[PDB]
Design a protein around this ligand. Structure first.
Ligand SMILES: Nc1nc2c(ncn2[C@@H]2O[C@H](COP(=O)(O)OP(=O)(O)OP(=O)(O)O)[C@@H](O)[C@H]2O)c(=O)[nH]1
Ligand SMILES: Nc1nc2c(ncn2[C@@H]2O[C@H](COP(=O)(O)OP(=O)(O)OP(=O)(O)O)[C@@H](O)[C@H]2O)c(=O)[nH]1
Ligand SMILES: Nc1nc2c(ncn2[C@@H]2O[C@H](COP(=O)(O)OP(=O)(O)OP(O)(O)=S)[C@@H](O)[C@H]2O)c(=O)[nH]1
Ligand SMILES: Nc1nc2c(ncn2[C@@H]2O[C@H](COP(=O)(O)OP(=O)(O)OP(O)(O)=S)[C@@H](O)[C@H]2O)c(=O)[nH]1
Ligand SMILES: [Mg+2]
Ligand SMILES: [Mg+2]
Lengths: 432, 429, 432, 429
């Protein structure tokens, strides 16, 4: 009944999607051909005779990444019309994504979404997977959001976005893409879950004992977090928190819609036996800065809201106890205008693990979504990066050549300045 | 003869409600299919208060199940006892309320309320002599809080001369279960003060304490907590459902426990709650029960009665026992703890006694206390509300649904006034 | 009707308690499960049907000693709520017992006592079992007594207190503990029965022919004396004495409330049947220094008051005769202000013997509670011990660290000096 | 129930520690995997004192292994019982200390200390009621000495109310193991005097003597030597870990044995000590054990108790034995050897008995003597320090790491003051 439509944009979005749909299949006992020898139904539609199809769209502006899906292990899982490719990519250029190349497929993408949505009886909303840095992930995504807002409007929209790192850069133009897409998508997105590749790599090396983590591993990890978010919809639970609830809980002001995601426990096979894993113990692990999936320091920020989603062999009293002790903890400060900081979800189903996966199978897990003033730092960094290049007009000609106007750059920048100030203002404590 | 209409709203409301129903059917010898397999004619004599008799010797709860979400309903349906309910009495939406009072009261809830009301009216019209309505829900979510208040408003308007009582799960001191729970509770309270006859303040924190400290349950489950609540609920209607020496009902209790209309917020209690090892060493007789009942550790509201005064207290005893003894016990507590009872209501302890004990036991006791200490809870909520509202935190979630700041403000004001009222009578000589 | 509540504090108190409750059960025919296939009632309450529960509280600041009771033979005999334990012991430190650690459970202990007392219709008072030397037995006990005095007052309080031996000892700081607890408890206790391990060991070796007596044996011996004291309440006798009466008889001045206990006959089956144990014979045995349970010499002091509690096959005339001859005896000198020095109790029930015990089964026995100026010696010794260590402030920092103040030491010492002088004054005969 | 945290610093610390752990495992019926395969319920009753219970019937030492170099750690990991430890509880550096206190305390150690501390804190928080910490280390090296002292300082700062005890491997008078060991010891001692609650002094010279002369071992190995230490350690905690008649613990021992804060340096001792042949020709009884305990050849510190006085002596007996006899023996030794016991502390002997004997034995005894004779060692150290420092030999190795002469000087002064204090109490009447 409570359908969820997933949209995977560009390489990051598609590859993450691969990992997510792989996991979903394992969790619901769906084979790679769509068959199984009732809960699945929020993510899989049902056709004809014992075949089940993901409620998803995969889009990329070049064919290579999606071609892998078509030719791969899960070729029979997706219907061909839900795998959409253009001919030429956005070449790390927001303008090409948003205008020049994106405007050629946007109608198509939306048409297919409409068809998907027409077979839903109780649409909860959308999960949009992309990156900040790519021309498609940045430019196309903003365009897509705009259209979605027009055709649906009041349906919860969620973005799992690979926020660029401080040190671990990939392209040179990442800051431009990040800034523009944030500016253009801001008024159209309800909640966005930031993730940082550096942090996940670190986690993999320290907590999973993995010498050389691959993008695959990162994707797998992300899939777990996503699964925890939607488990309350896909399974039965003692206390349930849904997609709408998150936005209500975690967003105190419309602009401040960027909670950070944390998962626990992420351990190896050897480290499963020598460690007990109570609810308090994993919650504490989550709430400690070293296990965070964005390269930021909460000790230097303030918490505005926490949502804790527990899963498996979990007891509500125990969670309450755990939270109580965390409340006392001096190193965790919450904003002074918020006496109530926790939304808590508890679900019966343990996290299911992919055969041959890097994570050990545990009786209890937890996914925290927490909104923090520490994000301000990242924004400041990004703005600084933008300023350095823009002062010289470095790369600007490309954007203008693809139909962007220079004034829009300055506009994006000023909007981000305003955003930065908004965070700062929120930070300070109540007078009188 | 004396029909009650039962309503369950939201996840909490429905999970507690199911347990309650299970308890009641067990009491009356009804199995999961609705057939009577009891032993005594006493179990069928007053079956009609909670069950309608259908064709082919089956019994069905006079129960309405309501939610904006379809999952919990489905779970209930799939549970043991899920099949006892009338399928047409499940009224569920598709959207949910997203922990937003506005959505429950004005938007999603609004679009569903008429459908509920239609069923409710039908149920009322089936019954010969409607005693009234009991609503089980939380104040902290969106449906129980917003939708629940709406339901209360409408039902009250329709049936102003029948009793409207609620079993309300109130947000707790230590943990915050949600972010916007203060808003949801505050709004709810504003309606409840105007439109209910009596409100049973159940707090999960207190329940946890009881389970861990008194029941010696290292690992309580929500089910266990729900069970306690259900037992307490059963306690209140036992004198209406069975022969007794001194017989109470819902109206009489209200009359005794409510000296002024607005001050109708009870702290309920149950005795005897005991551990498995600790059962055989103590003799469960009236004195033990009495000792258990009148103390802070056994109250299901997060407030110490020793921080205020008891305005009125109703004790309802079940089992074969000496009335004289009971009265003596009641006298003793009043006399020795004189300073904990407000002095302008003489003999502020009321008694009821029903001959039918609960299952497995020789006797039990159920407690309804109206204490001025509950004001502390209200104050906490007010403070929490203010802290958030002064910075307009989360406000656009509610204003987006058509709500204005004025409504919030009024709600706050009303809450404050109630607290002041409570204080005044606490202090009066 | 005439209920008596027993409180067992610390290791010594608990272990002795084990021996006492074992004995009571055998005496009343109560099995280790609380069942029996009306006299019991002063020591046992009755619960449900066919179960009897000791009117007792066991307290220690560490779990180890009480855990033995819980896991032991009489696990089902005691109600779980009457077994009270903390986490950390008082570490032979009065301060920890009286303040730092004791303040954590005192309220709890008292609450349970109140519950016990509320089920009594004719509460006589209390039996308190502890040691002078341990941090719990000294500090906790003193605290407890203070509370008892406030909350009950005129209801009687009786103490079996384990006095440290002159030559033998257990701790280094025993003197400190002994002195402080005596000081703090003095004005709050009605009567205190001293018993000393060295003396009992000697008795065991000489009279019972035991090469190697264990603490168990000592405990058993103590239990005999306690039984004799309570037999008047638990059985019917010719001439009866109840706990209030003792204090009136034994204590001539408020501060001088330290009698001593002596039990006889203590013999083995090897040496029981080459004797016939007449009243005169056992009385003489009792009144000789070799059978005493305090390492002190009455020959060097004066008697102030005796109470003789006879039990079993006894004839009042015979007792009178026995006493008369003892009055004449040169080695028994009584204070000048006391023309009549014996309260006599006579009970019909013989002392029944513990299966596997060291004592032989006899037709008669006697327990003397006798009050003597000879105890002054012990006090003098203890004072001397205190002064030696205090002159150097040895160990003092421990006590101060737990919140005790130096001035309190000097206060305790001076109070004891006064006590010593009081005994001396009492000793001398009246002028004219 | 009274959890102890175990810490191992440097090569010696880790080698001793491993052996100790092995010994404990055997005692509590724990195999190399961490599973319980014992028989008596007493083995698991107080298992939580040294072990954390992991998921699926495993038990893991509450142990931290710390070293500035990875070789010893590696060996431990590959050793018998290496797999029982939590992998995350091995915290090792890459550099090494080069037998330099400076490097351990200020440089390399400084770089590693936070990682240790983090683990330690976690371990502490695991425990319901932390009794305290035991540190196993040498004074003569760089890591155990410098890093260990630093760790102690931090732990004390964090948890000043929990007791810190140390099993300290001290430099022998006859044969110096390493060239700068006087400096390393002296510095270490400066920290130890202010930051530890009790310090067990062990010298390998004593151990060797015991092994060759008493145990009749022609060719002792370091493992064998370490076994003695392990036995002492286990003996010290036996009253905390098992039921007994008179139950000592770490706090009680400290109270009995430390009359003045700084004077907490013990000479540990153990009995019985018997060869394979020589055991059968003499019966193990209490008096014999006592006799074995009270002489110079059986002390684990190379100092003659006849050259000083005992301030305090604690004896802890394990096995079924008669209290009376024990007491008599204790009295007897005091009486007959009056001149070796300080005159201003009457009853200077503390007695404890635990009913659970060590494995293979019917009875045993562990001895803790606080003797003014330990001053000899300190004097020797001072002398050796002086001999080097007056010529500033090797000084640039320490000053090169940021240390200054002033620090050294103050350390020396402190040590001398302690010696003086010891002398004063030795000579007092
Ligand atoms: N977490 C994660 N990040 C990825 C993955 N692949 C790429 N990225 C990140 O995505 C950003 C690059 O954007 P892409 O998604 O490759 O670019 P695109 O959306 O295909 O856009 P164009 O190629 O410019 O059309 C960088 O920050 C990469 O680190 C992946 O599998 N997992
Ligand atoms: N007669 C007898 N004396 C005992 C027994 N157990 C301990 N003692 C004596 O009691 C004194 C020691 O005090 P304990 O009771 O062990 O100490 P505690 O009360 O547990 O206090 P802490 O352990 O310091 O908290 C010593 O004089 C022991 O000889 C026993 O079973 N019988
Ligand atoms: N006793 C009990 N309390 C519950 C249960 N579930 C939630 N609560 C309590 O209720 C409050 C929120 O309840 P919830 O069940 O989410 O209300 P709801 O109205 O169903 O939520 P919604 O449908 O509007 S989103 C919290 O204070 C929480 O502690 C339950 O199963 N038993
Ligand atoms: N009892 C015992 N003593 C040892 C052992 N190994 C070394 N020692 C003693 O410890 C001292 C030196 O130990 P060492 O291991 O060098 O300390 P360290 O801190 O690890 O040395 P470093 O890393 O700074 S160079 C010497 O006095 C030596 O006699 C052992 O296995 N058992
Ligand atoms: Mg691409
Ligand atoms: Mg003790």
């Amino acid at each position: 009944m409570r359908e969820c439509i997933s949209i995977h944009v560009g390489q990051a979005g598609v590859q993450i999607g691969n990992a997510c749909w792989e996991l979903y299949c394992l969790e619901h006992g769906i084979q790679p051909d769509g068959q199984m020898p009732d809960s699945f139904n929020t993510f899989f539609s049902e056709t004809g005779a014992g075949k089940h199809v993901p409620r998803a769209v995969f889009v990329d502006l070049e064919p290579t990444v999606i071609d892998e899906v078509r030719t791969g292990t899960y070729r029979q899982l997706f219907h061909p019309e839900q795998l959409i490719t253009g001919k030429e990519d956005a070449a790390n250029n927001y303008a090409r994504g948003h205008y020049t190349i994106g405007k050629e497929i946007i109608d198509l993408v939306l048409d297919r979404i409409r068809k998907l949505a027409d077979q839903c009886t109780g649409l909860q909303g959308f999960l949009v997977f992309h990156s900040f840095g790519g021309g498609t992930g940045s430019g196309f995504t903003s365009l897509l959001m705009e259209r979605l807002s027009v055709d649906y409007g009041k349906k919860s929209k969620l973005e799992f976005s690979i926020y660029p790192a401080p040190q671990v850069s990939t392209a040179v133009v990442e800051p431009y893409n990040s800034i523009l897409t944030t500016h253009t998508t801001l008024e159209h997105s309800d909640c966005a879950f930031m993730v940082d590749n550096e942090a996940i790599y670190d986690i993999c090396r320290r907590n999973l004992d993995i010498e050389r983590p691959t993008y695959t591993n990162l994707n797998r990890l992300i899939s777990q977090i996503v699964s925890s978010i939607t488990a309350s919809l896909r399974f039965d639970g003692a206390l349930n928190v849904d997609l709408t609830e998150f936005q209500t809980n975690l967003v105190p002001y419309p602009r401040i819609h960027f909670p950070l995601a944390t998962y626990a426990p992420v351990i190896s096979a050897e480290k499963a036996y020598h460690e007990q894993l109570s609810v308090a113990e994993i919650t504490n692990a989550c709430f400690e800065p070293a296990n965070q999936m964005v390269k930021c320091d909460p000790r230097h920020g303030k918490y505005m809201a926490c949502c804790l989603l527990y899963r498996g062999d979990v007891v509500p009293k125990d969670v309450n106890a755990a939270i109580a002790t965390i409340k006392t903890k001096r190193s965790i400060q919450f904003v002074d205008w918020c006496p109530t900081g926790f939304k808590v979800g508890i679900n019966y189903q343990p996290p299911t693990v992919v055969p041959g996966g890097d994570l050990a199978k545990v009786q209890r897990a937890v996914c925290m979504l927490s909104n923090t003033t520490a994000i301000a730092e990242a924004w400041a960094r990004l703005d600084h990066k933008f300023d350095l290049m823009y002062a010289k007009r470095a790369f600007v000609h490309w954007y203008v050549g693809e139909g962007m106007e220079e004034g829009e750059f300055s506009e994006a920048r000023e909007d981000m300045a305003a955003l930065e100030k908004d965070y700062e203002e929120v930070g300070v404590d109540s007078v009188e | 003869m004396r029909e009650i209409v039962h309503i369950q709203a939201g996840q909490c409301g429905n999970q507690i409600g199911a347990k309650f129903w299970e308890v009641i059917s067990d009491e009356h010898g009804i199995d999961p299919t609705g057939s009577y397999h009891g032993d005594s004619d006493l179990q069928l004599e007053r079956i009609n208060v909670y069950y309608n008799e259908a064709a082919g010797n089956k019994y069905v709860p006079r129960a309405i199940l309501v939610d904006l979400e379809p999952g919990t309903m489905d779970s209930v349906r799939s549970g043991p006892f899920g099949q006892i309910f009338r399928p047409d009495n499940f009224v569920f939406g598709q959207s949910g309320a997203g922990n937003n009072w506005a959505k429950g009261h004005y938007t999603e809830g609004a679009e569903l309320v008429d459908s509920v009301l239609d069923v409710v009216r039908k149920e009322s019209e089936s019954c010969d002599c409607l005693q009234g309505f009991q609503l089980t829900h939380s104040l902290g979510g969106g449906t129980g809080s917003g939708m629940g208040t709406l339901l209360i408003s409408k039902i009250r308007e329709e049936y102003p001369d029948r009793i409207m009582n609620t079993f309300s799960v109130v947000p707790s001191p230590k943990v915050s279960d949600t972010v916007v729970e203060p808003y949801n509770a505050t709004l709810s309270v504003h309606q409840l003060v105007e439109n209910t006859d009596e409100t049973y303040c159940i707090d999960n924190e207190a329940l946890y304490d009881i389970c861990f400290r008194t029941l010696k349950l290292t690992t309580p489950t929500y089910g266990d907590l729900n069970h306690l609540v259900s037992a307490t609920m059963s306690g209140v209607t036992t004198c209406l459902r069975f022969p007794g020496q001194l017989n109470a009902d819902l109206r009489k209790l209200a009359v005794n426990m409510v000296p002024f209309p607005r001050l109708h917020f009870f702290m309920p209690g149950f005795a005897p709650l005991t551990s498995r090892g600790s059962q055989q060493y103590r003799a469960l007789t009236v004195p033990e029960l009495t000792q258990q009942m009148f103390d802070a550790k056994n109250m299901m509201a997060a407030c110490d009665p020793r921080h205020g005064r008891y305005l009125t207290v109703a004790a309802v005893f079940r089992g074969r026992m000496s009335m004289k003894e009971v009265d003596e016990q009641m006298l003793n507590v009043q006399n020795k703890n004189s300073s904990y009872f407000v002095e302008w209501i003489p003999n502020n302890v009321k008694t009821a006694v029903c001959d039918i004990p609960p299952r497995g036991l020789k006797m039990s006791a159920t407690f309804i206390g109206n204490s001025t200490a509950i004001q502390e809870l209200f104050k906490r909520i007010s403070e929490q509300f203010t802290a958030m509202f002064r910075r307009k935190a989360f406000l656009h979630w509610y204003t987006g649904e058509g709500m204005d700041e004025m409504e919030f403000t009024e709600a706050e004001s009303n809450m404050n006034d109630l607290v002041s009222e409570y204080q005044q009578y606490q202090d009066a000589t």
